[PDB]
């Protein structure tokens, strides 16, 4: 309440602008748009409004093809995104005032757009102005991104988004799919192989199973190989455990009548692949057609690419989270994929999947879910829900002088322990 009496101090002002934005007529008028003014008149004034009053106070604007726009303030890396729409619904027919005419009463405000969104535009504008009246060491850069058109969404595939910045993070009443950073895109699939039934000379070696891996989203951090050995054991032995020296790896071998055990160990999380590093070991063998081309493909492909660059996808990221082989069904990698907004993954697949066929490998894909906004779990709207807690307990549309003042003091809690740390 040290915010709420700070806001105490700006009342007057708060309100002559609100009843400005309020006077002018942002209804929709797409019979009298034109380039200057893609949705009618009325929205376009509403729009240069906020770039008058943001300008009286100092602050940069940029608009974007008249449609929307942007105030901007603070520095550094990060910006936070705050949505917005001064546009309006018509009035309804029999008021008991003129619905654009505010009326100013002891303690509401009347007229439409009070509620949605002019009241909340205002207060979200005051709390940045009244931080940089305090002349605060920003941390992070704001962007109030305001909107005149309803048919948007704010979709990353919408006009404002087309071109400007995403916000790291922020607040979006309204908008299901706001393009702002939040939650990661996923998807997982499989990389069969075409078993290849083709006869052939008896190899060095033969591999009869290989299993790593239980979860898609998950490092394995085992892996085994069991292998038919013809003729040198012994070299094959001291190979793996060279191997296990180099790459600072735990593991072992079992033989019993023929067959040995390959095991190694690794470290997971969602720290090193345990089936990719032993598939690395057992390229350097002469291999049945299938074991070889099965660890081939691992090799050109999948060792070392933790960032997609050998599948030339690549912060995206790729976990391979099963493998697995045996004679009978000829072994498969599944894949976990995660990838931040404005990665190409249709067109990236298509390549891989096309590039691939060449080895008798093809993908299978599961369902893909593409990176979006999860308003619960944004940093800015839990400090927003904090500081309502931490503070509180269309015809005729007002709006109290106390939800007014009450909402300004909460943007501004909010706004400064995520911009002036707290």
Not at 349 to 377: C, S, T, W
């Amino acid at each position: 309440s040290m915010w709420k009496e700070k806001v105490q101090q700006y009342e007057d002002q708060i309100i002559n602008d609100l009843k400005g934005l309020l006077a002018i007529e942002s209804v929709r008028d797409d019979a009298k748009a034109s380039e200057d003014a893609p949705v009618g008149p009325g929205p376009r004034k509403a729009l240069d409004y906020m770039y008058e009053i943001a300008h009286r106070d100092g602050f940069t604007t940029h608009d974007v093809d008249h449609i929307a726009g942007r105030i901007e303030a603070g520095k550094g890396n990060d910006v936070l995104g705050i949505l917005c729409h001064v546009d309006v619904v018509p009035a309804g027919d029999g008021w008991d005032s003129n619905p654009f005419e505010p009326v100013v009463t002891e303690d509401a405000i009347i007229a439409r757009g009070t509620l949605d969104d002019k009241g909340p535009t205002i207060a979200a504008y005051y709390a940045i102005k009244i931080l940089e009246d305090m002349n605060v060491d920003w941390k992070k850069r704001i962007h109030m991104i305001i909107g005149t058109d309803e048919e948007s969404d704010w979709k990353c595939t919408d006009r404002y988004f087309k071109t400007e910045e995403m916000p790291t993070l922020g607040f979006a009443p309204d908008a299901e799919f706001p393009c702002i950073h939040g939650e990661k895109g996923i998807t997982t699939f499989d990389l069969v192989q075409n078993k290849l039934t083709e006869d052939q000379d008896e190899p060095d070696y033969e591999l009869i199973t290989f299993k790593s891996g239980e979860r898609y989203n998950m490092v394995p951090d085992h892996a085994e190989a069991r292998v038919l050995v013809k003729e040198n054991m012994t070299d094959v032995i001291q190979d793996f455990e060279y191997f296990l020296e180099q790459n600072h790896l735990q593991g072992d071998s079992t033989v019993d009548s023929g067959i040995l055990v390959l095991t190694v160990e690794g470290k997971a999380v969602h720290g090193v692949n345990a089936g990719l590093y032993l598939l690395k070991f057992l390229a350097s063998l002469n291999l049945d057609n299938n074991a070889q081309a099965f660890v081939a493909f691992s090799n050109r492909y999948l060792f070392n690419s933790d960032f997609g660059e050998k599948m030339g996808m690549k912060d995206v990221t790729t976990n391979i989270g099963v493998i697995t082989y045996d004679n009978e069904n000829a072994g498969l990698f599944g894949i976990n994929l995660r990838y931040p907004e404005g990665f190409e993954f249709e067109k990236a697949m298509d390549r891989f999947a096309n590039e691939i066929q060449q080895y008798g490998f093809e993908v299978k894909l599961g369902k893909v879910q593409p990176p979006h906004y999860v308003d619960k779990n944004d940093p800015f709207v839990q400090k927003l829900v904090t500081a309502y807690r931490n503070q509180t307990n269309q015809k005729n549309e007002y709006i109290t002088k106390k939800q007014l003042f009450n909402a300004t003091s909460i943007y501004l809690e909010a706004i400064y322990s995520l911009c002036v740390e707290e």
